[PDB]
Design an enzyme around this catalytic site. Structure first.
Site, PDB file in Angstrom:
ATOM      1  N   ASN A 142       0.830  -1.214   0.000  1.00 15.91           N
ATOM      2  CA  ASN A 142       0.000   0.000   0.000  1.00 15.91           C
ATOM      3  C   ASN A 142       0.866   1.267   0.000  1.00 15.91           C
ATOM      4  O   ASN A 142       2.111   1.181  -0.055  1.00 15.91           O
ATOM      5  CB  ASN A 142      -0.975  -0.063   1.191  1.00 15.91           C
ATOM      6  CG  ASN A 142      -2.379   0.469   0.851  1.00 15.91           C
ATOM      7  OD1 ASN A 142      -2.542   1.288  -0.075  1.00 15.91           O
ATOM      8  ND2 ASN A 142      -3.373   0.001   1.562  1.00 15.91           N
ATOM      9  N   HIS A 188      24.338   0.542  10.295  1.00 13.34           N
ATOM     10  CA  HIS A 188      25.659   1.115  10.615  1.00 13.34           C
ATOM     11  C   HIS A 188      26.212   0.484  11.888  1.00 13.34           C
ATOM     12  O   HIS A 188      25.454  -0.026  12.713  1.00 13.34           O
ATOM     13  CB  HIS A 188      25.547   2.626  10.888  1.00 13.34           C
ATOM     14  CG  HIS A 188      25.114   3.432   9.717  1.00 13.34           C
ATOM     15  ND1 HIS A 188      26.014   4.069   8.884  1.00 13.34           N
ATOM     16  CD2 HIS A 188      23.879   3.782   9.279  1.00 13.34           C
ATOM     17  CE1 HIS A 188      25.348   4.727   7.953  1.00 13.34           C
ATOM     18  NE2 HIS A 188      24.050   4.563   8.165  1.00 13.34           N
ATOM     19  N   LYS A 199      -0.546 -12.954  20.204  1.00 19.73           N
ATOM     20  CA  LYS A 199      -1.377 -14.157  20.130  1.00 19.73           C
ATOM     21  C   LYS A 199      -0.872 -15.092  19.043  1.00 19.73           C
ATOM     22  O   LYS A 199       0.010 -14.733  18.241  1.00 19.73           O
ATOM     23  CB  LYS A 199      -2.842 -13.782  19.903  1.00 19.73           C
ATOM     24  CG  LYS A 199      -3.083 -13.073  18.617  1.00 19.73           C
ATOM     25  CD  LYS A 199      -4.271 -13.714  17.912  1.00 19.73           C
ATOM     26  CE  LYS A 199      -5.586 -13.073  18.289  1.00 19.73           C
ATOM     27  NZ  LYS A 199      -6.727 -13.881  17.737  1.00 19.73           N
ATOM     28  N   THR A 223      12.038  -6.247  15.799  1.00 22.97           N
ATOM     29  CA  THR A 223      13.480  -6.225  16.027  1.00 22.97           C
ATOM     30  C   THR A 223      14.098  -7.606  16.046  1.00 22.97           C
ATOM     31  O   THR A 223      15.317  -7.732  16.129  1.00 22.97           O
ATOM     32  CB  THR A 223      13.788  -5.553  17.353  1.00 22.97           C
ATOM     33  OG1 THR A 223      13.219  -6.318  18.428  1.00 22.97           O
ATOM     34  CG2 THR A 223      13.191  -4.145  17.341  1.00 22.97           C
ATOM     35  N   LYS A 224      13.258  -8.633  16.007  1.00 20.78           N
ATOM     36  CA  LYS A 224      13.724 -10.005  16.094  1.00 20.78           C
ATOM     37  C   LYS A 224      12.792 -10.911  15.292  1.00 20.78           C
ATOM     38  O   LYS A 224      11.727 -10.468  14.841  1.00 20.78           O
ATOM     39  CB  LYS A 224      13.827 -10.472  17.550  1.00 20.78           C
ATOM     40  CG  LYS A 224      12.554 -10.606  18.285  1.00 20.78           C
ATOM     41  CD  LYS A 224      12.843 -10.696  19.765  1.00 20.78           C
ATOM     42  CE  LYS A 224      11.562 -10.697  20.595  1.00 20.78           C
ATOM     43  NZ  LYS A 224      11.896 -10.957  22.031  1.00 20.78           N
TER      44      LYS A 224
END
Lengths: 185, 185, 185
Positions: B84, B114, B182, B164-165
């Site tokens: 989108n 970086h 969930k 982030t993981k």
């Protein structure tokens, strides 16, 4: 038997590839293109385009390009509406905003959604839930307002807040998922 | 004896000012400019341009302008890809996305990064970590997908989530940093 | 006896509809329009336009379109400034940025703010608080930097972070509201 447009507006599962819905999205994108190309001094041209695009407005409104929406006609704003740069309103269902709203830059307001269930989502059918924002609301820049959310009068949404549920009148909310951080009344 | 491009794609420190890399970024931006200028009804021109720009695609794909990327050729999408409005994909390393992906507006997918160390960062050298997104994934609008992340099949990324993981298959994640909220299916 | 511009710059309540301020905003948008329309290969034209727009710069700077700002003249950047796609800087008050800044895509830096009280906010009067960013700072993609924030030398802002308070030098911050997640030393 209901059309896909009727299903969409009613909050039922619908197919966005429907020919009528496709024509209406092309219309919205055409008006949005014209809007985003207007010069910074073309205030009257901007007002006219926005009143044509949206479902309803008050006397005065101003939006900094770029702007994006799905249908246009599902957007209803009150008096003295302001939205800063690079906003997106996915108005599959109604987006109703009250008077004296100040919306910061990069704000996204969504009524469009998908089934969570993997099999249901892969049907390609979608749905929407309306968003209602009261009077004298300030939505901080980069906020996200999710489908089905109602924001009460005089509420403040902190910059960057991801609003996942209703916001009480006179509350300040922030964070992700946003929660009440201050009361104003 | 490795070129900067070879070091870039391999995930090692490289200099983006390299002439070969500068030319390839210029080419990506040229195609992206042509893409972003297309009218809302130019579906075939759009499909053609994206197939030229990306490393690989399935039969059908559609992205709402505006779109941004770094190289183009490092992006690989599966069948029936949809992204989108106003997405950004920094494809310094590979971005591989499975079939039936729905990506909301204002989504950013990064492989570019970086050094955390100031002297190391001011070397001006950078690196990348690839992103892998499975089949039947829904990425909610305004999500951020960080370098090195793998998203399992059927997963859902909540609007505004900062991932982030790695995200397990069949999980719903949300928040910042995103966490499992969930499980599905 | 102060003009609206003088109150604005001093952090007092001011009326943005002031004729002088409107003129100055139109100038900024004009220069930003010219900037955003430049081709990916027009580096010299880009450098000239940004040095015209900004209050001050070093020798070299580069911003990927699209870029947005309010005034231009309140933006002061240090040597070798880089900002990636689709940034917004609301420079009602000063935004001062040091040398060797890397700013990721979709980053928003705000100095503009409103009263929390709705009667006070509905006055339509606004105010600003400056933002200061030190040297060797990396601002991750999609970060939000709020008014009045100072970021120390060598700090790193994680992607997606919503920065509501000062960031110490040599610190990494992340989250929403952002907190220090790592010390660099």
């Amino acid at each position: 038997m209901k059309s896909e447009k009727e299903k969409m507006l009613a909050g039922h599962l619908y197919n966005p590839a429907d020919l009528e819905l496709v024509k209406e999205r092309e219309r919205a994108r055409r008006l949005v293109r014209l809007y985003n190309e207007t010069l910074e001094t073309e205030y009257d041209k901007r007002t006219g385009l926005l009143k044509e695009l949206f479902g309803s407005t008050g006397e005065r409104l101003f939006i900094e390009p770029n702007f994006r929406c799905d249908y246009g006609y599902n957007i209803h704003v009150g008096e003295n509406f302001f939205m800063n740069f690079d906003g997106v309103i996915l108005d599959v269902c109604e987006v109703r905003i009250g008077d004296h709203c100040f919306i910061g830059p990069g704000v996204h307001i969504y009524t469009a959604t998908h089934p969570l269930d993997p099999h249901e989502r892969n049907s390609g059918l979608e749905y929407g839930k309306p968003v209602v924002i009261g009077h004298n609301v300030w939505i901080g820049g980069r906020a996200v307002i999710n489908p089905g959310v109602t924001i009460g009068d005089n509420a403040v949404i902190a910059s960057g807040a991801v609003v996942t549920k209703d916001v009480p009148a006179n509350a300040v909310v922030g964070g992700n998922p946003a929660k009440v951080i201050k009361w104003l009344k």
